C-alpha cells in the first residue's frame, strides 16, 4: 500500500503536468484526472486529523482564545444561519461605521508565521512554496492542524470540515457547466490542485528526511483539498509588520463574517498592528453582521469562495476582442488604441449593470468601427490627442454613425455568444424551478444561467443604444463637445 500510493501520485503528477489538451478535450482530461484522484482517495483514510462533536461546541474556545490575546469579543456571537452557514449575530445594537472588530497580528496565520513554523525547513528548500504564499498557507494550516500543541488550535477546530468549492463537486454537478466560460477555470482548479498534491506528496514522502513535519506520517488528498479550500475561501492580503510588502493571512474571528453587497469596511491598522472592521450598516440586536467581501464575480465566488451570490451587483462575463491583422486599417487602429493605452486585442468584461461596458471597452469598440477618415483625425493635428482623451466617454461620440456601428456589433456578438451555450435561459429557469437539486448543482446551474443573463442584457442595451443613435443620426443632431 505505501509504495502503491506513491506510484499513483507519480502517475497523477505526470498527467497533471502535461500541457493543455486543447479546449475541445478538456472535459475528457478532467474525467481522466478525476478517475486517478478518486482511486487515490478511496485508498486513503480521509482527513488525517478529525475532531469530535459538532461544530458549535468549539466556538466558545475560539472566543476565549481571541479575548486572551487582545481581540474584540464583545457585541456578537457565532450562530448557524440557514442560508450562509455559520456567521456573526449582533448581541447589541451596532451603528453604521462603528468599530466593532479588531484582531491583533499574533492571532493571524500568515506566510511569515508559516516560515517560522515546523514547515520552515521545507519552505526554505522548496521553490514552489517560496513562490506561492497561498500554497504555503495551506501547508501551514495542515501542519498546525496536525500539531496538538499548536497556538492556532482554537481557530483550526472551528473551521468547516468541508466546502462548496468545485473541488468537492460530483462529476455530474460539474457537467452542468459544459460549454460555459466558467468550466475552464473549474478544470484548471482541479488540475492545479491534483498536480500540487502529487508534487508535494513526492517531496514529503521521498525527500530527506523524516523531519518533525507532521505530514510525513499522513498526507492525504482529502487533507490537501480541505487545506486549499480553507485558504481560497478565507485568505486575505495584509501588509507585513514593516509595511514594506504584502503577505497572505488567515484572520480568525473576523473571517466568520458572511458577505452582502456594499463597500469594504475592513482595513489593516499598521501602527497598532491589527485588523479592524467597522459596521457596514446599522445592525440591530439579533441581526446577522455582514461585510462586503470584494467586487468579485459569481464565477469567482463559486470557484474560489464556494458560493453563488444572488443579486451580486459586480457580476460580469468575459468577452475577447481584437483588431485582426487582416484588417486593412490594422496599423491605424492599433496606433490609435496604443495612444489610448489599449492593446490591439484583450479580454474585456460585460457587466450585468447599466451600462454593461466599461470606458475601455467603449473606446476599443469605437476604434474598432472607425472609418479611415475618423482614424486620421485621432492621429494627426492639434486636436488628435483631445479626441483620444474622450474616446471612452459616452457623452462625446466620434460620430452618430460610429455609435450605431459599434452598438450593432455588440448586439450581434453578444447574440452570437448566447448561441454557444448548451441550454437556453428559459430551460435553466425551468430546471431550477421544476427540479430539486443539491446546493452544489444549483450553484452550477445558476452560474451558467448568470452568464447567459449577462449576455442577454448586453443584447438589449446594445439594441436600445443602436436605436437611440440611429434615430439621432436621421435627425442630424449636433455632436457635443
Amino acid at each position: 500500500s505505501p509504495k502503491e500510493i506513491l506510484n499513483l501520485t507519480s502517475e497523477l503528477l505526470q498527467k497533471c503536468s502535461s500541457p493543455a489538451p486543447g479546449p475541445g478535450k478538456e472535459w475528457e482530461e478532467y474525467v481522466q484526472i478525476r478517475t486517478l484522484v478518486e482511486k487515490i482517495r478511496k485508498k486513503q483514510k480521509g482527513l488525517s486529523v478529525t475532531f469530535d462533536g459538532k461544530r458549535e461546541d468549539y466556538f466558545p474556545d475560539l472566543m476565549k482564545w481571541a479575548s486572551e490575546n487582545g481581540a474584540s469579543v464583545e457585541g456578537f456571537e457565532m450562530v448557524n444561519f440557514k442560508e450562509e452557514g455559520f456567521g456573526l449575530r449582533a448581541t447589541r445594537d451596532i451603528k453604521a461605521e462603528e468599530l466593532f472588530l479588531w484582531v491583533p497580528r499574533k492571532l493571524l496565520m500568515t506566510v511569515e508565521s508559516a516560515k517560522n513554523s515546523v514547515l520552515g525547513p521545507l519552505y526554505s528548500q522548496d521553490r514552489i512554496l517560496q513562490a506561492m504564499g497561498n500554497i504555503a498557507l495551506a501547508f501551514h494550516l495542515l501542519c498546525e492542524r496536525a500539531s496538538p500543541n499548536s497556538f492556532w488550535q482554537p481557530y483550526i477546530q472551528t473551521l468547516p470540515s468541508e466546502y462548496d468549492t468545485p473541488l468537492y463537486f460530483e462529476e455530474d454537478e460539474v457537467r452542468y457547466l459544459q460549454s460555459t466560460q466558467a468550466i475552464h477555470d473549474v478544470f484548471s482548479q482541479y488540475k492545479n490542485t491534483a498536480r500540487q498534491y502529487a508534487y508535494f506528496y513526492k517531496v514529503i514522502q521521498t525527500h530527506p528526511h523524516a523531519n518533525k513535519l507532521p505530514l510525513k506520517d499522513s498526507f492525504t488528498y482529502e487533507d490537501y483539498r480541505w487545506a486549499v479550500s480553507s485558504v481560497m475561501t478565507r485568505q486575505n492580503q495584509i501588509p507585513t509588520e514593516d509595511g514594506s510588502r504584502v503577505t497572505l493571512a488567515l484572520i480568525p474571528l473576523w473571517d466568520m463574517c458572511n458577505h452582502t453587497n456594499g463597500l469594504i469596511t475592513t482595513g489593516y491598522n499598521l501602527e497598532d498592528d491589527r485588523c479592524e472592521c467597522v459596521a457596514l450598516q446599522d445592525f440591530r440586536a439579533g441581526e446577522q453582521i455582514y461585510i462586503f467581501y470584494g467586487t468579485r464575480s459569481n464565477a469567482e465566488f463559486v470557484i474560489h469562495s464556494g458560493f453563488f451570490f444572488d443579486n451580486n451587483s459586480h457580476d460580469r462575463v468575459k468577452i475577447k476582442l481584437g483588431v485582426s491583422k487582416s484588417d486593412r486599417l490594422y496599423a491605424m487602429k492599433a496606433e490609435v488604441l496604443a495612444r489610448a493605452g489599449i492593446p490591439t486585442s484583450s479580454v474585456f468584461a460585460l457587466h450585468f449593470t447599466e451600462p454593461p461596458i466599461s470606458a475601455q471597452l467603449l473606446a476599443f469598440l469605437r476604434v474598432f468601427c472607425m472609418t479611415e477618415e475618423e482614424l486620421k483625425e485621432h492621429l494627426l493635428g492639434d486636436s488628435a490627442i483631445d479626441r483620444i482623451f474622450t474616446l471612452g466617454n459616452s457623452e462625446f461620440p466620434v460620430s452618430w454613425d460610429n455609435e450605431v456601428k459599434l452598438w450593432t456589433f455588440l448586439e450581434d456578438r453578444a447574440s452570437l455568444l448566447l448561441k454557444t451555450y448548451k441550454t437556453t435561459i428559459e430551460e435553466d429557469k425551468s430546471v431550477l424551478k421544476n427540479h430539486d437539486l443539491s446546493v452544489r448543482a444549483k450553484m452550477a446551474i445558476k452560474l451558467r444561467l448568470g452568464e447567459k443573463e449577462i449576455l442577454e442584457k448586453a443584447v438589449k442595451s446594445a439594441a436600445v443604444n443602436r436605436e437611440y443613435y440611429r434615430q439621432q443620426m436621421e435627425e442630424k443632431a449636433p455632436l457635443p463637445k
Binding site: V228, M232, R296, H304
Partner: peptide
C-alpha cells in the same frame, strides 16, 4: 479610502 483594505477571500493565482 482605507489605506490597507482587507478583501475577504481575495482571489489568488494557483496556476
Amino acid at each position: 479610502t482605507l489605506k490597507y483594505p482587507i478583501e475577504h477571500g481575495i482571489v489568488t493565482n494557483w496556476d
